[PDB]
Design an enzyme around this catalytic site. Structure first.
Site, mmCIF file in Angstrom:
data_model
loop_
_atom_site.group_PDB
_atom_site.id
_atom_site.type_symbol
_atom_site.label_atom_id
_atom_site.label_comp_id
_atom_site.label_asym_id
_atom_site.label_seq_id
_atom_site.Cartn_x
_atom_site.Cartn_y
_atom_site.Cartn_z
ATOM 1 N N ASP A 263 0.852 -1.179 0.000
ATOM 2 C CA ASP A 263 0.000 0.000 0.000
ATOM 3 C C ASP A 263 0.898 1.244 0.000
ATOM 4 O O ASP A 263 2.123 1.174 -0.178
ATOM 5 C CB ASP A 263 -0.973 -0.137 1.161
ATOM 6 C CG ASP A 263 -2.271 0.650 1.081
ATOM 7 O OD1 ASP A 263 -2.227 1.780 0.533
ATOM 8 O OD2 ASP A 263 -3.283 0.152 1.633
ATOM 9 N N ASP A 376 -6.100 2.170 -6.900
ATOM 10 C CA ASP A 376 -7.025 2.664 -5.897
ATOM 11 C C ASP A 376 -7.574 4.031 -6.352
ATOM 12 O O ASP A 376 -6.910 4.692 -7.142
ATOM 13 C CB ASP A 376 -6.174 2.864 -4.658
ATOM 14 C CG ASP A 376 -6.886 3.011 -3.337
ATOM 15 O OD1 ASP A 376 -8.061 2.614 -3.288
ATOM 16 O OD2 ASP A 376 -6.230 3.554 -2.404
ATOM 17 N N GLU A 379 -12.489 6.360 -8.933
ATOM 18 C CA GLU A 379 -13.893 6.719 -9.121
ATOM 19 C C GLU A 379 -14.064 7.834 -10.164
ATOM 20 O O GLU A 379 -15.070 7.833 -10.878
ATOM 21 C CB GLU A 379 -14.584 7.123 -7.820
ATOM 22 C CG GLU A 379 -14.817 5.951 -6.871
ATOM 23 C CD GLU A 379 -13.530 5.348 -6.334
ATOM 24 O OE1 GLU A 379 -12.593 6.103 -5.998
ATOM 25 O OE2 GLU A 379 -13.483 4.101 -6.235
ATOM 26 N N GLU A 381 -11.884 9.434 -7.002
ATOM 27 C CA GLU A 381 -12.419 9.706 -5.677
ATOM 28 C C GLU A 381 -12.814 11.182 -5.551
ATOM 29 O O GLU A 381 -13.791 11.505 -4.890
ATOM 30 C CB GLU A 381 -11.433 9.413 -4.554
ATOM 31 C CG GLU A 381 -12.057 9.541 -3.167
ATOM 32 C CD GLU A 381 -11.215 8.936 -2.056
ATOM 33 O OE1 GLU A 381 -10.216 9.578 -1.671
ATOM 34 O OE2 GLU A 381 -11.518 7.802 -1.603
ATOM 35 N N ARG A 427 -10.940 -0.401 -8.041
ATOM 36 C CA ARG A 427 -12.096 -0.085 -7.209
ATOM 37 C C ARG A 427 -13.282 0.412 -8.030
ATOM 38 O O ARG A 427 -14.418 0.425 -7.547
ATOM 39 C CB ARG A 427 -11.690 1.049 -6.269
ATOM 40 C CG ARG A 427 -12.337 0.971 -4.904
ATOM 41 C CD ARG A 427 -11.569 1.816 -3.903
ATOM 42 N NE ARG A 427 -11.819 3.243 -4.099
ATOM 43 C CZ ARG A 427 -11.587 4.156 -3.184
ATOM 44 N NH1 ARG A 427 -10.927 3.822 -2.108
ATOM 45 N NH2 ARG A 427 -12.005 5.401 -3.315
ATOM 46 N N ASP A 444 -13.892 0.288 1.086
ATOM 47 C CA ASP A 444 -13.465 0.466 2.452
ATOM 48 C C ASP A 444 -14.555 -0.017 3.405
ATOM 49 O O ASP A 444 -14.999 0.732 4.267
ATOM 50 C CB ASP A 444 -12.967 1.887 2.649
ATOM 51 C CG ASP A 444 -11.706 2.232 1.863
ATOM 52 O OD1 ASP A 444 -11.219 1.329 1.192
ATOM 53 O OD2 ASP A 444 -11.224 3.393 1.932
ATOM 54 N N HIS A 504 -7.430 -7.721 4.234
ATOM 55 C CA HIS A 504 -6.857 -6.385 4.097
ATOM 56 C C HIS A 504 -7.568 -5.418 5.055
ATOM 57 O O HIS A 504 -8.774 -5.352 5.075
ATOM 58 C CB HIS A 504 -6.897 -5.964 2.628
ATOM 59 C CG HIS A 504 -6.467 -4.545 2.386
ATOM 60 N ND1 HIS A 504 -5.173 -4.107 2.501
ATOM 61 C CD2 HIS A 504 -7.193 -3.445 2.031
ATOM 62 C CE1 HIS A 504 -5.124 -2.803 2.220
ATOM 63 N NE2 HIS A 504 -6.332 -2.380 1.931
HETATM 64 O O1 LIG Z 1 -4.472 3.084 0.027
HETATM 65 C C1 LIG Z 1 -5.018 3.344 1.310
HETATM 66 C C2 LIG Z 1 -6.409 2.725 1.406
HETATM 67 C C3 LIG Z 1 -7.503 3.722 0.968
HETATM 68 C C4 LIG Z 1 -8.408 3.278 -0.147
HETATM 69 N N1 LIG Z 1 -9.613 2.585 0.355
HETATM 70 C C5 LIG Z 1 -8.643 1.828 -0.454
HETATM 71 C C6 LIG Z 1 -7.860 0.838 0.374
HETATM 72 O O2 LIG Z 1 -7.712 -0.444 -0.234
HETATM 73 C C7 LIG Z 1 -6.478 1.376 0.690
HETATM 74 O O3 LIG Z 1 -5.961 0.339 1.525
#
Ligand SMILES: OC[C@H]1C[C@@H]2N[C@@H]2[C@@H](O)[C@@H]1O
Ligand SMILES: O=C([O-])C(=O)[O-]
Length: 781
Positions: A263, A376, A379, A381, A427, A444, A504
């Site tokens: 990560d 990650d 979206e 985000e 995601r 999450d 995870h």
């Molecule tokens: O990268 C930090 C963290 C935040 C995003 N929710 C995803 C998650 O898989 C990830 O572990």
């Protein structure tokens, strides 16, 4: 007020003129049609279609009041005045436009039949039947969700109806779906902008429907077999030492491990302010090439997280700006905005320059030893409205960003490593993102029972519309202050019977099974080994997914297509053809009621036989397992457990067949290849083992065969133990290829018997050599 004016048949497509404009109808297969409104105008291309340009010979006929445009099974019926298209399979009404395309906002309206049930929308927690609900089409985080959500990471602009059609809104933009909420009998689709197109796909069964849909939207390429292994993951390993110690922990604790996942600390020591570095933080990861090589020596792959954003505080800001890799404001400058992680831009994967800049970074890291990729926050985000991408604004392209990100990374990985299968975990995507190998997870999720309880609903909703490898963060991800042991165990038990075994969580509580207490490990260790022992079963379901779209997890309602009420079930599901699984999703549950389809079923763990003519089955629960029934007629294949799929071998096979006279004919299949070659299926470099059981009053006959051209390292001869559950105690005679063999009736577990009947367990064990020639085993009274 809309009415027909004229039509031409150009290429093989039907072009209609109304008073409002042009409509292009192209059959993309015999059972799937693209309907494009505003066909005259310039708009975004299709994102959903694997072959957007294609169209196939259809029939056109004309009457006073109607046009009729027909392929193989699907017919579009165009009423002229008022203008309305409806859709037919045979002469069964699937779906009728109401007002249809409205136009200023893009808007489409259709009638819903009374009693019609509507699955869809991708990730929501609303109930399996989404009719009576309204929600946006705007991919967005839902941090710490549990038992409810109208809006999450990965929506799909698509539905599946109980009339066995799929409808796709082939539109990438900020939008909404209203499934007979506002108006009881109206399905409405809406977007602020983007393409004004929908796709209708029909089928004669849910499997056929899914085959037809993946035909035109894309088939998932067979992932590498290692994607079916055990992942070590948390958020996050802080160092090379810590990552090495976790690989060690798996080895010292005797848990299987294929892949460790890194990560965002791999590129900097803080959550904030480093994103976009896309390079090792050498203070904490001083020798990563050695690290990854050392892991490869133990059959362990490395996967690295990446994200869309480059922060202005990152080492790559000036370079990305210089390369013109980021999205711009309308004024022509790099757009910067304040994320959680800090102030930064977003890489423009829709541009030539963004794609090349990003691709080149993935190339360098992949050359260093990275085997697989995690993306990650796609979206995206955070995606301000006035961000400008090469092909449109943020609100216009939003729901296709992650999709194109995947396409980009896939193409790049195929070009760098044409003899390897890409691993891409993301995601957020769009309809068809499976054709780029996308492996999604459900974001999450909170560390609560509600978080677990929602995972089947989410998995099935995604599975049904193309995403076989949808899974969850096992054990849960978000918040918590202390481990909820029982919930953790339940979650990692369910894990075994869902697509990707990847625990995870935020690292204040350990996510990995190797860091749990003695009791927890003693429960999960054999189940994780079991996942490896079952690799033949899972990998064969994966093969069928690549072939036909058939998801690994199937809903209860597949079991009876004429019983629509089964559609509501989200507590029991099929893992492959043969296992009905019921996860335990609350604390201290002492028993469960399992709505088993009519037929004969066995307790997977205990071998108890159950027959039912409809009534549910009450099984007790224990902490060491979760309830799993095996369908009579199943062939369950196993191989010996290994620590890593790199060491996989099928030299030794163990197959358990669940006999019952209620099943006079049964089939199974085992798909073997090298586990790595992306062309194995296309080029027939595989070994497809088939087994056919014929079960009559006095005989039980098995026919074994192999097809395909095989592959390097394929065993010519497999030592095969066939265990027949619920075997009759009346079999006097075995012959193998016409040669008679006595069946022993004692000491089955304690002699090297070729055939032995265990009277106490009602199991008949046959041990033999399965080579390339056909084999018949015949038991007779
Ligand atoms: O990268 C930090 C963290 C935040 C995003 N929710 C995803 C998650 O898989 C990830 O572990
Ligand atoms: O046929 C059978 O299985 C029996 O009679 O036991």
């Amino acid at each position: 007020a809309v009415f027909y004016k004229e039509h031409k048949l150009r290429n093989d497509g039907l072009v209609i003129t109304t008073n409002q404009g042009n409509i292009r109808l192209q059959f993309k297969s015999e059972a799937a049609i693209e309907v494009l409104y505003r066909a005259d105008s310039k708009q975004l291309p299709s994102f959903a279609l694997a072959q957007p340009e294609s169209a196939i010979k259809a029939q056109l006929t004309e009457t006073e009041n109607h046009l009729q445009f027909s392929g193989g099974t699907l017919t579009a019926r165009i009423q002229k005045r008022p203008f309305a298209i409806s859709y037919y399979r045979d002469s069964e009404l699937l779906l009728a436009e109401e007002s249809g395309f409205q136009v200023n906002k893009i808007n489409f309206r259709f009638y819903l039949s009374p009693g019609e049930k509507i699955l869809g929308g991708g990730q929501r927690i609303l109930g399996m039947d989404r009719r009576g609900q309204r929600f946006p089409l705007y991919n967005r985080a839902h941090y710490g969700y549990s038992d409810h959500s109208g809006q999450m990471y990965f929506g799909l602009p698509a539905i599946m109806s109980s009339k066995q059609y799929i409808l796709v809104f082939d539109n990438s933009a900020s939008g909404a779906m209203d499934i007979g909420k506002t108006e009881s009998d109206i399905l409405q689709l809406e977007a602020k902008s983007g393409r004004s197109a929908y796709i209708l796909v029909a089928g004669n069964s849910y499997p056929s429907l899914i085959e037809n849909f993946t035909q035109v939207t894309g088939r998932q390429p067979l992932p590498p077999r290692w994607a079916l292994g055990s992942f070590a993951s948390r958020f996050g390993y802080r160092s090379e030492a810590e990552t090495r110690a976790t690989v060690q922990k798996y080895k010292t604790e005797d848990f299987p491990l294929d892949t460790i996942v890194l990560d965002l600390y791999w590129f900097g020591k803080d959550i904030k302010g480093h994103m976009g570095n896309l390079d090792w933080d050498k203070e904490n990861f001083p020798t990563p090439l050695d690290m990854m090589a050392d892991f490869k020596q133990q059959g362990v792959k490395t996967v690295l997280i990446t994200e869309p954003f480059v922060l202005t505080s990152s080492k790559r800001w000036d370079d990305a700006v210089k390369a013109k890799a980021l999205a711009k404001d309308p004024q022509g400058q790099p757009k910067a905005f304040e994320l959680y992680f800090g102030n930064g831009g977003i890489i423009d994967v829709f541009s030539k320059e963004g794609s090349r800049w990003f691709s080149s970074i993935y190339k360098d890291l992949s050359k260093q030893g990275v085997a697989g990729w995690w993306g990650d926050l796609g979206e995206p985000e955070m995606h301000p409205e006035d961000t400008q991408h090469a092909i449109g604004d943020a609100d216009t392209v939003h729901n296709a960003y992650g999709h194109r990100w995947a396409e980009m990374l896939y193409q790049q990985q195929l070009d760098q490593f044409p003899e390897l299968r890409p691993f891409i975990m993301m995601r957020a995507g769009f309809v068809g993102s499976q054709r780029y190998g996308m492996i999604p997870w459900t974001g999450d999720v909170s560390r609560t029972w509600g978080g677990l309880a929602s995972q089947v609903e989410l998995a099935l909703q995604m599975s049904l519309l193309g995403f076989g490898y949808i899974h969850s963060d096992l054990g849960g991800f978000a918040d918590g202050e202390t481990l909820d042991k029982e919930m953790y165990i339940r979650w990692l038990q369910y894990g075994v019977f869902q697509p990707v075994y990847r625990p995870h969580g935020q690292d204040h509580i350990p996510s990995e099974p190797v860091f749990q207490d003695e009791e927890t490990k003693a429960i999960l260790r054999p189940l994780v080994k079991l996942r490896y022992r079952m690799l033949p079963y899972i990998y064969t379901a994966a093969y069928q997914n690549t072939l036909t779209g058939m998801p690994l997890m199937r809903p209860l309602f597949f079991s009876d297509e004429k019983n629509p009420a089964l559609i509501d079930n989200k507590t029991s599901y099929f893992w492959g053809d043969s296992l009905l699984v019921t996860p335990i999703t609350q604390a201290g549950v002492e028993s469960v009621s399992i709505p088993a389809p009519k037929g004969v079923w066995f307790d997977f763990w205990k071998d108890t036989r159950y027959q039912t003519d409809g009534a549910p089955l009450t099984l007790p629960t224990d902490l060491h397992t979760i309830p799993v029934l095996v369908k009579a007629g199943a062939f369950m294949p196993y191989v010996p457990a290994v620590s890593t799929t790199e060491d996989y071998r099928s030299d030794s096979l163990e197959i358990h067949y669940y006999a019952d006279a209620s099943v006079p004919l049964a089939q199974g299949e085992i798909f073997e290849d090298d586990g790595k070659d992306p062309n194995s299926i296309k080029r027939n470099q595989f070994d497809l083992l088939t087994l056919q059981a014929t079960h009559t009053d006095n005989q039980l006959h098995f026919q074994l065969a192999r097809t395909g051209k095989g592959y390097r390292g394929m065993p010519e001869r497999r030592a095969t133990t066939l265990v027949i559950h619920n075997a009759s105690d009346q079999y006097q005679h075995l012959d193998i290829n016409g040669k008679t063999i006595a069946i022993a009736q004692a000491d089955c577990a304690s002699t090297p018997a070729l055939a032995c009947y265990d009277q106490e367990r009602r199991q008949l064990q046959l041990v033999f050599t399965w080579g390339r020639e056909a084999l018949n085993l015949r038991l007779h009274k």
